[PDB]
């Protein structure tokens, strides 16, 4: 019956994540930090897909990389949900718009929420939504929006942050201002260290890059892709990172073993809000502004997604669950390195379900 | 020819001193001393020894019979990487033979000095004289002299040489070291790629690490591998045979970029060497002392015999480090110095130990 679909969804999420990666890369400036959540965006879009028809249905399916009649997905996606994030995602809608019952049941069954309703005046809503996002993200994301349209009929939202932490704590006392290769200068940045941190790692020839997985709480890992030499730039690594490439990177990593290892990386501290309409368009999906068929969601025939915000917050500092083993006094028994000293690309990958929860990159902490 | 033979003899002598020094000193103490400069001072005295004292010194110093070349060889060995002072003083009532003073001048390029008249004038004389010719590194060689002093042997020495490769001072934090069974925090130097020749010796159960210094000197470090082995038991397992092999090995062993931590080495050790000579079973310097060659005077004894080593190895090097050591190029090789350890400061050219010692607590 289902089960099938954890695998199939898994694949589709990888493919989608890259699509977003590049589209995000594009909308952002050229040497910028970014972070976004393929999972939570895909789930929000998959919520919308539930009540899409004819064209909008086939077009979403296309974007999200789902095959035809992938009905199981809505269960599967709820099943995937990690407790290592706090992921909020409501469809709002104006009073003049009337939401179908058969949708609201299916939304409740499967997404355990349902479209909310906007107040009467435009200006009342902005405070509503920012309060509502703040409340259900425990104030991590307070201000999701700075404006709404005036004629707003259908708003999609998605705030998300990483609550998970490192399995293994980093000693804060062992965190100096060490060097990082920004642009062609060198800059000095807070950098975390452990003489023996547990690390699964290897080299990939195709990317010409160092791949480093680091364990986190809730069966999440952080996968880091740094180019090996400084002679390779990040941009050209991005453009060489196929979905086929990527999937092999993870199959490899699953076999690859965590071993005590000399570790430096920076404090990761990335927050990225993004008008996703721009992105959807960048992916060649224009339905959210014209020819939008959400029959399933509503009967109303003159329908368009007035706004679609995404926001990721992501801190990985020293704090871990478990304090480090054998005090890392020396580096006895281990003879391995992984240092992160130039701009790099990262997943935050679910190990259990084999898909990317977050994705991004760091040029400058 | 005698460079080889002297080389061997100096190794053997150095250990003999090591243990004797180990013995006179307390149990978990830093020490540092110079086998070369002590041996040379004793070899100066050997020049004018006769019958018994001659054969007994020869024995101690590990020289074979009729090793006449030695005095040249030893002068030839002298490194510019140290500042080594070593005078035989003597009182006015004692008369030094001419044939000695010429041979001393020829070979040791100095000659016995003479003491003032009153005991108390001499102490200031000698400490000034040692200060002057050691550029104030060793000021106060002595705190007392005997009263009836007739023959004083002295030897101050310090290491002027430095690391080939500088250590970054910015990269020197208060990191941990395993003193006693506690842990203490001590200034520790680091380089992600320092050039280091190293290996493991099973006999000692120890890490051996050579590090290059200026003037064809190296610093050889012997740390026990695990914390489970103590230093004391490593000392007692360190034969001359063991040691000589350690160096033959090291000569073949290659310097390679390597992850390095060690402490700041900062050791100064003054020592009444009579105590040592006795500890080595050489009693001539207080009775049955035959220095016919040095003097005709028949009622002769070495009233005092001081040694003093100063030894700083901090970050300062000749050459600043290559490729900035930004990351760790080629392989991860390691040598970390985090528990008490034993060291040579070894002449590579001539193959003998200039200094020897150990560090329990920086
Ligand atoms: O964990 S570590 O040794 O780096 O961290 C500090 C440490 O510096 C402090 O120890 C000493 O305490 C005196 C106060 O008398 C300070 O002058 C110095 O900071 C330090 O020499 C301890 C003491 O609370 O605090 C931290 O753990
Ligand atoms: C509610 O939704 C599920 C399918 O989404 C279905 O099993 C059930 O029949 C629905 N019930 C009602 C009252 O709509
Ligand atoms: C000086 O010393 C050398 C070697 O000991 C010797 O050849 C020479 O005869 C000595 N001369 C005198 C006058 O003492
Ligand atoms: O590298 C040494 C320098 O580091 C930092 O830039 C400090 O601001 C400066 O005062 C110091 O001398």
From Swiss-Prot, chain B:
Changing residue 258 to P: In HAE1; phenotype consistent with hereditary angioedema type 1. Changing residue 209 to R: In HAE1; phenotype consistent with hereditary angioedema type 1. Highly glycosylated (49%) with N- and O-glycosylation. O-glycosylated with core 1 or possibly core 8 glycans. Cleaved by C1S in vitro. Changing residue 322 to T: In HAE1; phenotype consistent with hereditary angioedema type 2. Changing residue 362 to R: In HAE1; phenotype consistent with hereditary angioedema type 1. GO terms for molecular function: serine-type endopeptidase inhibitor activity. Changing residue 357 to R: In HAE1; phenotype consistent with hereditary angioedema type 2. Changing residue 331 to P: In HAE1; phenotype consistent with hereditary angioedema type 2. Glycans are attached at residues 102, 117, 136, 216. Its main location: secreted. One of its GO terms (biological process) is blood coagulation. It is found in: Secreted. Changing residue 138 to V: In HAE1; phenotype consistent with hereditary angioedema type 2. It comes from the Eukaryota. Keywords: Blood coagulation, Disease variant, Disulfide bond, Fibrinolysis, Glycoprotein, Hemostasis, Protease inhibitor, Repeat, Secreted, Serine protease inhibitor, Signal. Changing residue 320 to E: In HAE1; phenotype consistent with hereditary angioedema type 2. Changing residue 322 to V: In HAE1; phenotype consistent with hereditary angioedema type 2. The record marks 330-331 as: Cleavage. The record marks 330-331 as: Reactive bond. GO terms for cellular component: blood microparticle; collagen-containing extracellular matrix; endoplasmic reticulum lumen; extracellular exosome; extracellular region; extracellular space; platelet alpha granule lumen. The record marks 329-330 as: Reactive bond for chymotrypsin. Serine protease inhibitor, which acrs as a regulator of the classical complement pathway. Forms a proteolytically inactive stoichiometric complex with the C1r or C1s proteases. May also regulate blood coagulation, fibrinolysis and the generation of kinins. Very efficient inhibitor of FXIIa. Inhibits chymotrypsin and kallikrein. Interacts with MASP1. (Microbial infection) Binds to E.coli stcE which allows localization of SERPING1 to cell membranes thus protecting the bacteria against complement-mediated lysis. It is linked to Angioedema, hereditary, 1: An autosomal dominant disorder characterized by episodic local swelling involving subcutaneous or submucous tissue of the upper respiratory and gastrointestinal tracts, face, extremities, and genitalia. Hereditary angioedema due to C1 esterase inhibitor deficiency is comprised of two clinically indistinguishable forms. In hereditary angioedema type 1, serum levels of C1 esterase inhibitor are decreased, while in type 2, the levels are normal or elevated, but the protein is non-functional. Belongs to the serpin family. This is Plasma protease C1 inhibitor. The gene is SERPING1. The chain holds residues 137 to 498 of 500 of the full protein.
């Amino acid at each position: 019956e289902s089960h099938s679909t954890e695998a199939v969804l898994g694949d589709a999420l990888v493919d989608f994540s890259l699509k977003l990666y590049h589209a995000f890369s594009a909308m952002k400036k050229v040497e910028t930090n970014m972070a976004f959540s393929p999972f939570s965006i895909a789930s929000l879009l998959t919520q919308v897909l539930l009540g899409a028809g004819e064209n909008t249905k086939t077009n979403l399916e296309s974007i999200l990389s789902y095959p035809k009649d992938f009905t199981c997905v809505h269960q599967a996606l709820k099943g995937f949900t990690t407790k290592g994030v706090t992921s909020v995602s409501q469809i709002f809608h104006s009073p003049d718009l009337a939401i179908r019952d058969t949708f609201v049941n299916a939304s409740r069954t499967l997404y355990s929420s349902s479209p909310r309703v906007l107040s009467n005046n435009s200006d009342a809503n902005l405070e509503l939504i920012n309060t509502w996002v703040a409340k259900n993200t425990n104030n991590k994301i307070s201000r999701l929006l700075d404006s709404l349209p005036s004629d707003t009929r259908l708003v999609l939202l998605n705030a998300i942050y990483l609550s998970a932490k490192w399995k293994t704590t980093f000693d804060p006392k062992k965190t100096r201002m060490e060097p990082f290769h920004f642009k062609n200068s060198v800059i000095k940045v807070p950098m975390m260290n452990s003489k023996k941190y547990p690390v699964a790692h290897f080299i990939d020839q195709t990317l010409k890059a160092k791949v480093g997985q680091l364990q986190l709480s809730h069966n999440l890992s952080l996968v880091i892709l740094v180019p090996q030499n400084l002679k390779h730039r990040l941009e050209d690594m991005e453009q060489a990172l196929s979905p086929s490439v990527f999937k092999a990177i993870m199959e490899k990593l699953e076999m690859s073993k965590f071993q005590p290892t000399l570790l430096t990386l920076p404090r990761i501290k990335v927050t990225t809000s993004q008008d996703m309409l721009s992105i959807m368009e960048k992916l060649e999906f224009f339905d959210f502004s014209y020819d939008l068929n959400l029959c399933g969601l509503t009967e109303d025939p003159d329908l368009q997604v007035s706004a679609m915000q995404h926001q990721t917050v992501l801190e990985l500092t020293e704090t871990g669950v478990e304090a480090a083993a054998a005090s890392a006094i020396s580096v006895a028994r281990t003879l391995l390195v992984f240092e992160v000293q130039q701009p790099f690309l990262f997943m935050l990958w679910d190990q259990q379900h084999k898909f990317p929860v977050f994705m991004g990159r760091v040029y400058d902490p």
